Paper text:
Here, we characterize the structure and function of a thermophilic dNDT, the protein from [name] (CtNDT). Nucleoside 2′-deoxyribosyltransferase (dNDT) enzymes catalyze transglycosylation via a covalent 2′-deoxyribosylated enzyme intermediate with retention of configuration, having applications in the biocatalytic synthesis of 2′-deoxynucleoside analogues in a single step. The reaction catalyzed by dNDT proceeds via a ping-pong mechanism, with the formation of a 2′-deoxyribosyl-enzyme intermediate covalently linked to an active-site glutamate.13 Transglycosylation occurs in a stereospecific manner, preserving the anomeric carbon in the β configuration in the newly formed 2′-deoxyribonucleoside. As with other NDT enzymes, the active site of CtNDT is formed by residues from two monomers, and therefore, it is only fully formed in the dimer/tetramer.
Author numbering:
A (entry chain D): 2 to 45, 54 to 155
B (entry chain C): 2 to 153
C (entry chain B): 2 to 154
D (entry chain A): 0 to 155
Write the structure that this text describes.
Amino acid sequence: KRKIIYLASPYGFSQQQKTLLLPPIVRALEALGIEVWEPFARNNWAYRVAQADLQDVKNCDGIFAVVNGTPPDEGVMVELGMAIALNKAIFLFRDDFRRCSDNERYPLNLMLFAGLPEIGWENYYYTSVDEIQSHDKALYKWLTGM
Amino acid sequence: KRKIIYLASPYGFSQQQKTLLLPPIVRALEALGIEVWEPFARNNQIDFSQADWAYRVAQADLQDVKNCDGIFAVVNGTPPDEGVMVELGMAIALNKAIFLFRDDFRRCSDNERYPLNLMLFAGLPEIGWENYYYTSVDEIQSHDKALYKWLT
Amino acid sequence: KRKIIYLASPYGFSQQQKTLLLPPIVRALEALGIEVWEPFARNNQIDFSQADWAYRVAQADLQDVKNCDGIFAVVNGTPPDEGVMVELGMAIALNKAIFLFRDDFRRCSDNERYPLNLMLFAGLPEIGWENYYYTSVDEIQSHDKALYKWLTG
Amino acid sequence: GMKRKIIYLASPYGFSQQQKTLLLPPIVRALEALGIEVWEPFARNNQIDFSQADWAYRVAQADLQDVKNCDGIFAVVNGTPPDEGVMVELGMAIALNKAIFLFRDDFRRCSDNERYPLNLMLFAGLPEIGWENYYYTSVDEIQSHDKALYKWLTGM
Ligand SMILES: *[C@@H]1O[C@H](CO)[C@@H](O)C1(F)F
Ligand SMILES: *[C@@H]1O[C@H](CO)[C@@H](O)C1(F)F
Ligand SMILES: *[C@@H]1O[C@H](CO)[C@@H](O)C1(F)F
Ligand SMILES: *[C@H]1O[C@H](CO)[C@@H](O)C1(F)F
C-alpha cells in the first residue's frame, strides 16, 4: 500500500548532519504516507553495503535525492542515475542557494534532470523542507495517482 | 562490428582539457578497435548550454548510455563529476560493461576497500575489480586488463 | 574585551543547515566566553547575492577576518568550501589563531599525514596539530584542546 | 620596461598524471613567454605522489614560503569547486597584498552570486570595477597586453 521512497543523501557522513538534518526530512516524507528507506539508517563490508544499497534502489518506487552541495554527492548521483535508467519516480531536493551548473536552464548539471520532463521539471524540484508537504508538487500528486 | 564505448568525463568543460586530454584517451581506446562515443563532441556541448538546448543535450547523452556497450568513466577529481556519476549509475542499472579511469593520486573515499565512494564499484566484481580500474593513459592498452579481455 | 572567533562555514548556503547546524556550534563557542562572528547573519548573505551587492559582501567578510582574533573553519565537505578556504588562507597569512572543524568521517587528502589537503594545516604546528582539529561539536569545549587553552593560557 | 616578476602558479593540475604532463607546461610556457619567473609548486617542491607523513609538513611550508616570497599568484581556478589548496594559497596572497590573477577556462559556473562566475571571495582582493582584466579564460589570453598581467609587468 505505502509507496516506498529511497532517500539518497550525503547527510549520513557528518555526525551533526545525520542527527539533525535527516530526521525532519524523514518526518515530512512520512507525513505524506510514504514508506522511507534511508540508507544510513538501514545499513547500521564495503561490497555488501554497496549491493545492499543497490538492492534498495532497484526495489524502491521513487528516489528522493538530496542534491545539496557543490557538487552533489557522487554516491547520490550514482543512485540517481540508477533510478532514471530503471524508470523509478524521481524527486530532487536542494535548499542550497548556490548554482553549480553547465547550462542556463537548470541550477545544476543538466544530467540530474534527464529523467524529468522538459516542462514542469520544477514541480519535482523541492527547495525547502517546508515544501515537501505541498499538494501542488509532484510528490503529493504521484502518491494520489496524479 | 566494433564494441561501443561511451567515454564519460568532465574534460569537455575546460578548453585546454578538451583539446589536450580527451584526444589521447580517445586514441588509446580506438587502438583497441573500439568505436568511441565521446559526448562533448558527439552531441555538441561546447559552451555553457543555452536554455533551449539543455534538454536535447541531456536526452542525447542519456540515449548514448542506453545504446553503448560499455562506459569508460573518467573519475578524476574530488569528487568525481556529478554528470559522469549519473551516467555511470545508468550504466550499472542497464548492466553495461563498466570501466573506471583515475590518474588522480588524491585519496577521497568513504571506505578503505575502494579508492572512491563504494557505490561507484557496485557494478564491478567483489574480487578483481582492480582489473577494470585504470590508473594511467598508457595502461588502457594493457593486454592483461579488463578492456582488452572484454574484447576477448 | 571578549576574544573574537570568525565562524567560517558553508552552512549558511543551505536553509536547513543554516537553521539547525550553525546555532549549536555558535552556542558551543559562546559557552567558552567567545564572541562569535558568523558571517552569513552578520553580513546578510541570505540568498544568491544580487550583483550590486556581491562586492560589498566580499569586503565585509574580508574585513571581519582581518579584525577577528581567530578563525573557526568548518571544513566539512568534499572538498572543503572554497570561500571558507580563501578566508582560512587570509587567516593564516595574518597570524590569526586557526581552529578547524570536521565531523565528516570521509578522508579526502593528498598526503598520508593529514585528513585533508595539507595546505589547510600549513598554519598549524608540525607536532600537535590534532589539538586544533575538532571532530565533533561536543569536543569543542574540551578543557584539553587548543581552543580552550588559547582562551585561558 | 618589463620586470622579471615572480608568479606563483597555483593549480590542481599536479594531482593527475596526464594533467601534470600536458596542461601545466603550456601554462608555464605562456607565463615564461612574458619574461616571468614561474614558481610551479608541484615541480619546485617535489610533490610527485601521495606524500609521505614525514614529508607533508615540508611540502606545506615550502608552498607557503613560496607564496610569501612571490610577487603575484596565478591561480588556476578550474573545477567545481576550485581546488581547496589553491584557494588557501589565494587567501594568503590576498592577505599579503600580492598581485592576483585568476585562470579559468572551465565553462561551468559554481557561484553564490550573480556578479562573478565563482564564489565572490575569490575576487575579494580584486578591484570592484575591472576585475575581468585580472581574469583569464584561455591559455592564449595570458600574453595579451590589454590584460592586467602584461601591464603589471611593465608598469613598475
Ligand atoms: C555526460 O558526461 C559529461 C560530464 O558531465 C556531460 O557531457 C554529459 F553531457 F552530461
Ligand atoms: C566568508 O564567510 C562565508 C563563508 O562562505 C561567506 O560569506 C564568505 F563570504 F565566503
Ligand atoms: C601546495 O599544496 C597545494 C595543493 O593544491 C598545491 O597547490 C601545493 F603546491 F602543493
Ligand atoms: C548509497 O550511496 C550514497 C553514498 O553517498 C549513500 O546514499 C549510500 F547509501 F551509501
